[PDB]
Design a protein around this motif. Structure first.
Motif, short mmCIF file in Angstrom:
data_model
loop_
_atom_site.label_atom_id
_atom_site.label_comp_id
_atom_site.label_asym_id
_atom_site.label_seq_id
_atom_site.Cartn_x
_atom_site.Cartn_y
_atom_site.Cartn_z
N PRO A 53 6.43 -3.66 -12.72
CA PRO A 53 6.03 -3.92 -14.00
C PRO A 53 7.09 -3.80 -15.12
CG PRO A 53 5.01 -1.67 -13.12
CD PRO A 53 6.12 -2.73 -11.83
N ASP A 54 8.20 -2.73 -16.00
CA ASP A 54 9.10 -2.56 -16.26
C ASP A 54 10.43 -3.29 -16.51
OD1 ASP A 54 10.08 -1.26 -14.23
OD2 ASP A 54 11.63 -0.33 -15.45
N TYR A 55 10.56 -4.70 -15.34
CA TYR A 55 11.71 -4.87 -15.40
C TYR A 55 12.36 -5.85 -16.19
CZ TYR A 55 15.34 -7.53 -13.45
OH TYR A 55 16.79 -8.64 -13.40
N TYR A 56 11.16 -7.02 -17.27
CA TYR A 56 11.33 -7.31 -18.08
C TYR A 56 11.24 -6.80 -19.10
CZ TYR A 56 12.21 -11.56 -14.78
OH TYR A 56 12.72 -12.18 -13.36
N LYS A 57 10.38 -4.92 -19.69
CA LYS A 57 10.72 -4.99 -20.29
C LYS A 57 11.76 -4.14 -21.26
CE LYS A 57 5.72 -3.03 -19.95
NZ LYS A 57 5.63 -3.57 -18.85
N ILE A 58 12.63 -4.15 -19.80
CA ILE A 58 14.17 -3.73 -20.54
C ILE A 58 14.99 -4.99 -19.40
CG2 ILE A 58 15.58 -2.36 -18.90
CD1 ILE A 58 14.42 -0.26 -20.15
N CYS A 83 29.56 -20.34 -17.38
CA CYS A 83 28.77 -20.21 -16.07
C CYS A 83 29.59 -18.25 -15.53
CB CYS A 83 29.21 -21.41 -14.46
SG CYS A 83 28.88 -20.91 -13.56
N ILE A 84 31.20 -18.22 -15.55
CA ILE A 84 31.20 -17.04 -14.85
C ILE A 84 30.18 -15.85 -15.57
CG2 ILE A 84 33.21 -15.00 -14.74
CD1 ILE A 84 34.67 -17.77 -14.23
N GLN A 85 29.99 -16.07 -17.27
CA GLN A 85 29.33 -15.52 -18.20
C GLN A 85 27.21 -14.85 -16.98
OE1 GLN A 85 28.78 -17.11 -21.46
NE2 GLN A 85 31.27 -16.45 -22.20
N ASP A 86 27.03 -15.87 -16.68
CA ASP A 86 25.81 -16.27 -15.85
C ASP A 86 25.88 -15.37 -14.59
OD1 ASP A 86 24.19 -17.53 -18.14
OD2 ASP A 86 24.35 -19.59 -16.33
N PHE A 87 27.16 -14.85 -14.06
CA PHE A 87 27.23 -14.29 -13.08
C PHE A 87 27.57 -13.24 -13.48
CE2 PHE A 87 28.56 -18.05 -10.88
CZ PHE A 87 27.79 -17.43 -9.13
N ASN A 88 28.02 -12.67 -14.77
CA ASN A 88 28.71 -11.08 -14.84
C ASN A 88 26.69 -10.99 -15.46
OD1 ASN A 88 30.86 -10.58 -14.62
ND2 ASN A 88 31.80 -12.07 -16.02
N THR A 89 26.20 -11.53 -16.09
CA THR A 89 24.96 -11.50 -16.83
C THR A 89 23.78 -10.96 -15.56
OG1 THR A 89 24.80 -12.43 -18.88
CG2 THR A 89 22.94 -11.66 -17.72
N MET A 90 23.54 -11.27 -14.46
CA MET A 90 22.81 -11.19 -13.26
C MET A 90 23.54 -9.78 -12.21
SD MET A 90 22.73 -13.11 -9.21
CE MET A 90 24.32 -12.81 -9.37
N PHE A 91 24.90 -9.30 -12.23
CA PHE A 91 25.35 -8.56 -12.27
C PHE A 91 25.35 -7.31 -13.14
CE2 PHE A 91 28.22 -11.12 -9.98
CZ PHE A 91 27.89 -10.88 -8.92
N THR A 92 24.94 -7.50 -14.40
CA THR A 92 24.88 -5.87 -14.97
C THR A 92 24.20 -5.85 -15.10
OG1 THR A 92 25.24 -8.10 -17.46
CG2 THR A 92 27.18 -6.99 -16.72
N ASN A 93 22.79 -7.03 -15.31
CA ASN A 93 20.86 -6.63 -15.44
C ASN A 93 20.55 -4.97 -14.43
OD1 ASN A 93 21.04 -8.35 -17.66
ND2 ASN A 93 20.10 -10.29 -16.47
N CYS A 94 21.34 -5.83 -13.05
CA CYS A 94 21.28 -4.67 -11.28
C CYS A 94 21.64 -3.61 -12.32
CB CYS A 94 21.89 -6.00 -10.97
SG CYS A 94 21.52 -4.88 -8.84
N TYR A 95 23.00 -3.33 -12.30
CA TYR A 95 23.59 -2.19 -12.75
C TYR A 95 22.48 -1.76 -13.83
CZ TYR A 95 26.99 -4.34 -10.10
OH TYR A 95 27.74 -5.24 -8.79
N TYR A 97 18.94 -1.60 -15.02
CA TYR A 97 17.63 -1.33 -14.30
C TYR A 97 17.50 -0.50 -13.42
CZ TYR A 97 13.23 -2.62 -12.56
OH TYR A 97 11.85 -1.64 -12.69
N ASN A 98 18.39 -0.17 -12.22
CA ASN A 98 18.98 0.40 -11.22
C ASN A 98 20.09 1.71 -11.88
OD1 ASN A 98 17.10 -1.20 -9.49
ND2 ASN A 98 18.96 -2.31 -10.17
N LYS A 99 20.23 2.18 -10.60
CA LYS A 99 20.82 3.65 -10.17
C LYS A 99 21.48 3.75 -9.59
CE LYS A 99 18.58 7.38 -9.33
NZ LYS A 99 17.83 8.47 -8.79
N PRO A 100 23.06 4.27 -9.77
CA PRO A 100 23.88 4.56 -8.76
C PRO A 100 23.49 4.62 -7.30
CG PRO A 100 24.72 5.04 -10.10
CD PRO A 100 22.99 4.73 -10.62
#
Ligand SMILES: CC(=O)c1c(C)[nH]c(-c2nc3ccc(N4CCN(C)CC4)cc3[nH]2)c1-c1cnn(C)c1
Length: 125
Positions: A53-58, A83-95, A97-100
């Motif tokens: 429920p907080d994913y798009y709040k972040i 296009c590469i910037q979209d790939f980097n955005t997808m990875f950075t969003n994952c790091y 929102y989530n934790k190591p």
């Protein structure tokens, strides 16, 4: 709640097709798509289905390989760097929102290595 997915076409945004963009779809996207850890990144995050429920709040700039695939198929990008910037955005969003240590982080780290592994050498013009 889920916001509308990122646009994959825009009548005001100019289209373009390049050798590197064809390479980004044919070999970069389609190989990453077949990786065993690709399934969490093949579609926009469904915050309702996934109990996030907080994913798009972040995450205010979401991105996924499904959106990237459609954008490459519709010649949405002007050059390969966009296009590469979209790939980097997808990875950075994952790091962001989530934790190591999370399974989703280990899977994004594996795809990111293979991504950088395949964009290390791009075709010329
Ligand atoms: C927060 C985060 O970084 C995440 C990202 C970028 N993606 C997912 C994700 N999780 C999924 C679970 C199942 C599926 N499927 C299986 C069925 N198939 C038809 C496709 C849909 C897709 C999924 N994407 C998560 C995630 C991590 N934790 N949670 C609870 C969600």
């Amino acid at each position: 709640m889920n916001p509308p997915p990122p646009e994959t076409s825009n009548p005001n945004k100019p289209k373009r097709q390049t050798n590197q963009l064809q390479y980004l779809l044919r070999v970069v996207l389609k190989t990453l798509w077949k990786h065993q850890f690709a399934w969490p990144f093949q579609q926009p995050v469904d915050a309702v289905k996934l109990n996030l429920p907080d994913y798009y709040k972040i995450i205010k700039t979401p991105m996924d390989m499904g959106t990237i695939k459609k954008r490459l198929e519709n010649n949405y990008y002007w050059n390969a760097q966009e296009c590469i910037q979209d790939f980097n955005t997808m990875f950075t969003n994952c790091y962001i929102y989530n934790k190591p240590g999370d399974d989703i982080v280990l899977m994004a780290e594996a795809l990111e290595k293979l991504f950088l592994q395949k964009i290390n050498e791009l075709p010329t013009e």
